[PDB]
Design a protein around this ligand. Structure first.
Ligand SMILES: *[C@@H]1O[C@H](CO)[C@@H](O[C@@H]2O[C@H](CO)[C@@H](O[C@@H]3O[C@H](CO)[C@@H](O)[C@H](O)[C@@H]3O)[C@H](O)[C@H]2NC(C)=O)[C@H](O)[C@H]1NC(C)=O
Ligand SMILES: *[C@@H]1O[C@H](CO)[C@@H](O[C@@H]2O[C@H](CO)[C@@H](O[C@@H]3O[C@H](CO)[C@@H](O)[C@H](O)[C@@H]3O)[C@H](O)[C@H]2NC(C)=O)[C@H](O)[C@H]1NC(C)=O
Ligand code: NAG
Ligand code: NAG
Ligand code: NAG
Length: 613
């Protein structure tokens, strides 16, 4: 039965990505506010499943699905049962998802060699910790079970999977259910981090971090926001830079060198395009519009970084890089333009291909205040400080401390192993842990490569699988996944029409995600949690929550606060404090000057009537 099917699943060519398909082609360059549901309708998904598995499937595509499943039930293969979980849980080939049967077959895979394969036990160990999926109406449905999942996590990390021991460390570090226990968190964090540092090369560790494309972004920022407009915080989308022929080309290659969200990147067509430009312009180099040559030499900076990169080619060329960018500075003398990244990679290639350290300090130091310096320079210097104890440069400590904050990633590890090893007792113990996770969570490719899946396999269709993915990273320390999944589980109804028509369990999960996101910083989520409990009871819990938000300077919390005391369930009714709240909103913002005193108008309109009796 099976080994014939291997030819078929070879034939079908699944696990499709659209951004790779839009990398090459001319395209709309256009997407926003695409589509979402607001109600789940469990018994609707079953009939939709029925329709699609009736019609849109192919008769062959049934034929393959026929006998792996028919052969696996007749035969104990256990390889097809593992695949169909990854097919009805991932929708990896063109088939629907059904977490009931997927969950059902996962125990079958596990029982075959109970507790050996960490890649699977983890996946259902989440499924226990939710209770929302692997659910239904038949008998085997069970709600959430903490400990029964917890043990499986311990089995995986005991076996040695990474993100398991990650989520344990986060779970202690946050005080999710168990106590705080910073010590353990430190232990397994540093363990993880040494394994990560072992994943890389010496060369690749020291010279360039390889630019894995980032998706740790807070969905609902594409639309207005988690709430409204103007009264939000920190939109994390970073897309499609822009501010006279060539400049429209310049950006048009930059976007192709680092297209981040909706179109995959690679340099090759941008590169060929670029070298065409250098072969084109160079003899025709008079003045030529000092604003144009600006973007010319900027594309030269880029270009030299690309030859030294080795993108698109089989190898990098240090040499044509050398002539081309050294030329670039030969111009940059004239018009005194930006010079940074050329000074970096020039001071870097001299540092490992040649061995004139001396000038290399001159270049690094010549570009050190540059904005493009993230942390790379300092991290590269402190090496030479610890190697060559020379007075010229200062302490390694302060330099690496100037690289930590800026975001350059290797800087953390040295900055961490330093302080823990420090016979000099620096600030504390717990802060040390904050470093390690901040490294871990930021490497983002070994640990969390599925953000490129969840996003991707959302936009075509079928949010639910992305929802499971964020429901697999929300347990990790990724705020973005928490508010993402919750924003999929509960959208805010507009004031007019209607709240949703969803499950109560589902809300019991969403609220937990929003809460943890709140205590990772996103104040707005707190507000949203309160807007759940309007529809429920627990007005006291909500009041504590809102009140928890207001102390950190929000606004909507406050209007809800005065409004909760004036109308609805208040333990004591009072409008003295109320107008204070309603007025300090206008104290702080200066922009809602009217609605404050409007609330005052209705508030005294109460008094006019009540004096009648
Ligand atoms: C997930 O997969 C299961 C299959 O394990 C799908 O199950 C179907 O569930 C219905 C009850 O909702 C079962 O009822 C059947 O009704 C027909 C008449 O319509 C009757 O002739 C059968 O004897 C039975 O009573 C149905 O047998 C069952 N079929 C299968 C293959 O399981 C379920 O619909 C899927 N859900 C989702 C959300 O994908
Ligand atoms: C849990 O079990 C699954 C199978 O149910 C294991 O899948 C195996 O994963 C490894 C890679 O981690 C695959 O290795 C590579 O496969 C390709 C062909 O697909 C081959 O060309 C490479 O040389 C290499 O052997 C392996 O084939 C794959 N096995 C099956 C049947 O798909 C999974 O690895 C197990 N979990 C863990 C954590 O290992
Ligand atoms: C979950 C499951 O039933 N696995 C089956 C087992 O029950 C059956 O007895 C055996 C016979 O070879 O094949 C396999
Ligand atoms: C390179 O080093 C040699 C000897 O170390 C020195 O003579 C030469 O001036 C250096 N060149 C540059 C460009 O720094
Ligand atoms: C109130 O909140 C608790 C959570 O502490 C929850 O278990 C309970 O179901 C809620 N009750 C109502 C009526 O909302």
């Amino acid at each position: 039965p099976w080994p014939e099917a291997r030819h078929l699943l070879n034939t079908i060519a699944k696990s499709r990505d659209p951004m790779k398909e839009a990398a090459m082609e001319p395209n709309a360059d256009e997407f926003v506010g695409f589509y979402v549901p607001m109600d789940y309708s469990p018994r609707n998904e079953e009939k939709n499943y029925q329709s699609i598995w009736q019609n849109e499937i192919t008769d062959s595509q049934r034929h393959i699905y026929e006998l792996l499943v028919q052969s696996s039930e007749q035969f104990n293969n256990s390889e097809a049962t593992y695949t169909l979980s990854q097919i009805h849980l991932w929708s990896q080939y063109n088939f629907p998802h059904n977490m009931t049967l997927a969950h059902k077959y996962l125990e079958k895979f596990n029982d075959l060699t109970h507790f050996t394969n960490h890649s699977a036990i983890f996946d259902l160990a989440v499924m226990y910790a939710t209770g929302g999926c692997a659910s239904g109406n038949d008998q085997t449905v069970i709600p959430q079970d903490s400990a029964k999942a917890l043990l499986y996590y311990q089995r995986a990390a005991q076996l040695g999977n990474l993100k398991a021991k990650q989520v344990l460390a986060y779970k202690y570090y946050s005080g999710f259910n168990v106590p705080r226990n910073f010590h353990k968190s430190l232990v397994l964090y540093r363990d993880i981090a040494e394994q990560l540092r072992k994943s890389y090369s010496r060369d690749e560790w020291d010279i360039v971090f390889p630019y894995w494309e980032s998706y740790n972004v807070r969905i609902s920022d594409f639309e207005s926001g988690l709430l409204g407009k103007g009264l939000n915080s920190v939109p994390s989308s970073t897309v499609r830079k822009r501010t006279r022929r060539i400049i429209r080309i310049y950006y048009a290659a930059l976007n192709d060198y680092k297209g981040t969200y909706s179109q995959s990147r690679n340099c090759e067509r941008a590169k060929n395009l670029l070298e065409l430009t250098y072969k084109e312009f160079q003899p025709h180099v008079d003045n030529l519009d000092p604003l144009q040559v600006f973007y010319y030499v900027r594309c030269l900076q880029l270009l030299g970084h690309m030859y030294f990169t080795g993108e698109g080619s089989s190898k990098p060329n240090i040499h044509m890089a050398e002539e081309i960018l050294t030329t670039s500075l030969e111009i940059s003398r004239r018009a005194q333009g930006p010079i940074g990244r050329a000074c970096i990679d020039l001071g870097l290639i001299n540092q490992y291909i040649t061995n004139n350290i001396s000038q290399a300090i001159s270049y690094y130091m010549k570009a050190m205040k540059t904005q493009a310096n993230n942390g790379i320079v300092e991290f590269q210097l402190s090496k030479l400080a610890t190697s060559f104890p020379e007075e010229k440069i200062g302490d390694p400590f302060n330099l690496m401390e100037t690289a930590y904050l800026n975001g350059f990633i290797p800087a953390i590890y040295e900055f961490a192993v330093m302080i823990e090893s420090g016979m000099n007792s620096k600030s504390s113990v717990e802060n040390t842990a904050y470093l390690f996770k901040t490294f871990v969570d930021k490497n983002e490719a070994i640990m969390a490569p599925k953000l490129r899946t969840a996003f991707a396999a959302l936009i075509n269709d079928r949010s639910e699988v992305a929802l499971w993915a964020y429901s697999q990273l929300a347990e990790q320390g990724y705020e973005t996944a928490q508010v993402s999944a919750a924003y999929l589980m509960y959208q805010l109804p507009y004031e007019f029409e209607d709240p949703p028509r969803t499950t109560d369990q589902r809300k019991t999960l969403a609220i937990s995600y929003y809460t943890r996101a709140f205590k990772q910083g996103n104040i707005d989520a707190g507000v949203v949690a309160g807007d759940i409990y309007f529809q429920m009871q627990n007005y006291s819990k909500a009041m504590a929550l809102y009140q928890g938000a207001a102390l950190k300077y929000s606004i909507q919390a406050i209007w809800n606060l005065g409004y909760m005391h004036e109308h609805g369930l208040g333990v004591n009714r009072d409008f003295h404090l109320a107008k204070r709240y309603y007025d300090q909103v206008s104290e702080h913002d200066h922009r809602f000057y009217l609605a404050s005193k409007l609330s005052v108008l209705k508030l005294h309109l109460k008094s006019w009537l009540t004096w009648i009796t």
